[PDB]
Tab-separated table of C-alpha atoms and ligand atoms in Angstrom:
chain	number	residue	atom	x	y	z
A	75	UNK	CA	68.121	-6.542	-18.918
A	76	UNK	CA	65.029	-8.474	-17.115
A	77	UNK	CA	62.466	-5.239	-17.232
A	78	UNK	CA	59.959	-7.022	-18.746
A	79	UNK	CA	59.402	-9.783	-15.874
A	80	UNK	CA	57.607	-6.240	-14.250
A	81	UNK	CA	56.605	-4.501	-17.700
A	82	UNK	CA	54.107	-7.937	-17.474
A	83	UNK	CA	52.681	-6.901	-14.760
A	84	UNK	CA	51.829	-3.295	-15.428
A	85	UNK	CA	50.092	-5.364	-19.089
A	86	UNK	CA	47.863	-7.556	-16.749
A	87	UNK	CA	47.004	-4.631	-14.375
A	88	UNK	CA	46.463	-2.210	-17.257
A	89	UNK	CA	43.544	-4.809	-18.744
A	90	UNK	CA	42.058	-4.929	-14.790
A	91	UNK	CA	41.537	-1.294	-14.997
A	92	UNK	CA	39.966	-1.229	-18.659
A	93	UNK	CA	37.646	-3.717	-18.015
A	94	UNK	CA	36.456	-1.846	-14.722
A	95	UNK	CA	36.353	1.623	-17.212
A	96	UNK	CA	34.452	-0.383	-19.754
A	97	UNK	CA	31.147	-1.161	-17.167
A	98	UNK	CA	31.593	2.823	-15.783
A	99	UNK	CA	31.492	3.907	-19.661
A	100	UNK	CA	28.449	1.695	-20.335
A	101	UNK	CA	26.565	2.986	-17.780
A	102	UNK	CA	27.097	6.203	-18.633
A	103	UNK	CA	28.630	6.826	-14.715
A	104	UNK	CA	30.612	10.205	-15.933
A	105	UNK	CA	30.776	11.437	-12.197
A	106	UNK	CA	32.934	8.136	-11.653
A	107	UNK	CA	34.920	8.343	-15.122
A	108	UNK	CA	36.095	12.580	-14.044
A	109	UNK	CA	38.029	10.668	-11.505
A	110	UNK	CA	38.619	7.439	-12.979
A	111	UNK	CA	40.122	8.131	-16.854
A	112	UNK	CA	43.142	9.574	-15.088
A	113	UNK	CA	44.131	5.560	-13.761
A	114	UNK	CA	43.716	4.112	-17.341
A	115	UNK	CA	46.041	7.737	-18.997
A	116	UNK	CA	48.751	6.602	-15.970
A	117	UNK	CA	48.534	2.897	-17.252
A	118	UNK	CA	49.717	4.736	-20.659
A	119	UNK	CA	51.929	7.549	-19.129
A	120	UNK	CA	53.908	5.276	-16.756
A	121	UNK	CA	54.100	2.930	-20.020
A	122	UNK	CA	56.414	5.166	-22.476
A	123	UNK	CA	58.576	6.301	-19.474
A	124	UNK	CA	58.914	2.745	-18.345
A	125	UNK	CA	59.638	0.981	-21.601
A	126	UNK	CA	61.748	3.596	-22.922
A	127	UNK	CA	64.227	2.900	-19.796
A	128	UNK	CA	63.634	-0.454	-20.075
A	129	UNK	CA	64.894	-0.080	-24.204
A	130	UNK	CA	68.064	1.447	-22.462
A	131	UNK	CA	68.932	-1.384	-20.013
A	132	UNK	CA	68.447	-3.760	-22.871
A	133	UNK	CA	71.261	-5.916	-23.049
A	134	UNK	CA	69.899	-9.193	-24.174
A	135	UNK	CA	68.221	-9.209	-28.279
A	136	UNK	CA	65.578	-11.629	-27.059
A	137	UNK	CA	64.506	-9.917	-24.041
A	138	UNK	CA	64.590	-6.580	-26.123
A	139	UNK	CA	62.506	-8.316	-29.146
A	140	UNK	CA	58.878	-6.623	-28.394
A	141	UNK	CA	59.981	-3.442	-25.903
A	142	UNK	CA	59.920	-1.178	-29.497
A	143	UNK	CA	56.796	-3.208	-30.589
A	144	UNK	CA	54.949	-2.497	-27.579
A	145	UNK	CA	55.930	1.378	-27.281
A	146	UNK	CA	54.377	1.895	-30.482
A	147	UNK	CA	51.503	0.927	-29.151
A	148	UNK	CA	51.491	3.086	-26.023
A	149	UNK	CA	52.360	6.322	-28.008
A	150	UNK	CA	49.282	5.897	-30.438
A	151	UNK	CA	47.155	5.163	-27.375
A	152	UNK	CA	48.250	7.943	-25.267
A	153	UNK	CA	47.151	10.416	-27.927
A	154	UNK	CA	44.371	8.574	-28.432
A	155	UNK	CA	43.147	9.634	-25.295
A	156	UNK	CA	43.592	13.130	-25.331
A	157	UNK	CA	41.454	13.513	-28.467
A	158	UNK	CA	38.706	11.089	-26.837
A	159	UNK	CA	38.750	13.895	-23.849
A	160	UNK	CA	38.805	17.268	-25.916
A	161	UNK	CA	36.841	16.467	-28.994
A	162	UNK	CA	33.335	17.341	-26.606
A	163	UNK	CA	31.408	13.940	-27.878
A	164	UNK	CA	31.430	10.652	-25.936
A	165	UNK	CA	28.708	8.907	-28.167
A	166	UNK	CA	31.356	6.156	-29.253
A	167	UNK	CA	33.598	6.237	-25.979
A	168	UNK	CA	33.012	2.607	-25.054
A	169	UNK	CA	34.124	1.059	-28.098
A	170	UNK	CA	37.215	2.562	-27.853
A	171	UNK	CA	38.086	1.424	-24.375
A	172	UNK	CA	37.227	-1.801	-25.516
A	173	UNK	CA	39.410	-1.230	-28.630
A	174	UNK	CA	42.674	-0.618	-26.235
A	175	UNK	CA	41.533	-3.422	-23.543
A	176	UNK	CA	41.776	-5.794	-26.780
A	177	UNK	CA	45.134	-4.372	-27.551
A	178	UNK	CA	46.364	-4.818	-23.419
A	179	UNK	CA	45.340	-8.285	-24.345
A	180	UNK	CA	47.735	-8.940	-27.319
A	181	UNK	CA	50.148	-7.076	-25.056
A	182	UNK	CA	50.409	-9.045	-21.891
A	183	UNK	CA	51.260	-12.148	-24.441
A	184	UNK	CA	53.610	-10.697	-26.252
A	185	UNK	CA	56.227	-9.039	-23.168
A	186	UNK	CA	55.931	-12.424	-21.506
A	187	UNK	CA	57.237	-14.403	-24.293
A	188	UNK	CA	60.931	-14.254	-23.913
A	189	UNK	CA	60.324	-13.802	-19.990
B	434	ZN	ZN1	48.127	1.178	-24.356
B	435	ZN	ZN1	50.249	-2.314	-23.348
């Protein structure tokens, strides 16, 4: 029923990790990011298992009113970053990162709003 009073928490510590991948990406670190874009895919991967469960111990309409809205979210950006990893170009990379650190940030505003 209450899921999201910890689904906050994985929001705000999803963000702390993007904006740590961000500074690696900009300085063009890759030795650091071949053991470091693994922690931002589990901040997606641990998402859609976690809010899924969460959209099955739902049992209040208010605390269930952005769970959906949010796992939307999660499945574009986890195959988001598969193609980001397998095209063989990282000229753009950054933006990106910053495009789903701004999207964490709409995130962490929404789960906590019914809280
Ligand atoms: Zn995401
Ligand atoms: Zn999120």
């Amino acid at each position: 029923m209450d899921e999201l009073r910890e689904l906050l928490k994985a929001e705000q510590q999803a963000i702390k990790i993007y904006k740590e991948v961000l500074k690696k990406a900009k300085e063009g670190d890759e030795q650091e990011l071949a053991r470091l874009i693994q922690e931002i895919v589990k901040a997606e991967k641990q998402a859609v298992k976690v809010y899924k469960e969460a959209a099955e111990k739902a049992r209040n309409p208010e605390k269930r009113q952005v769970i959906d809205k949010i796992l939307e979210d999660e499945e574009k950006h986890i195959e988001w970053l598969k193609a980001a990893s397998k095209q063989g170009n990282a000229e753009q990379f950054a933006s990106l990162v910053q495009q789903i650190l701004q999207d964490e940030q709409r995130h962490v505003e929404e789960i906590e709003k019914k809280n």
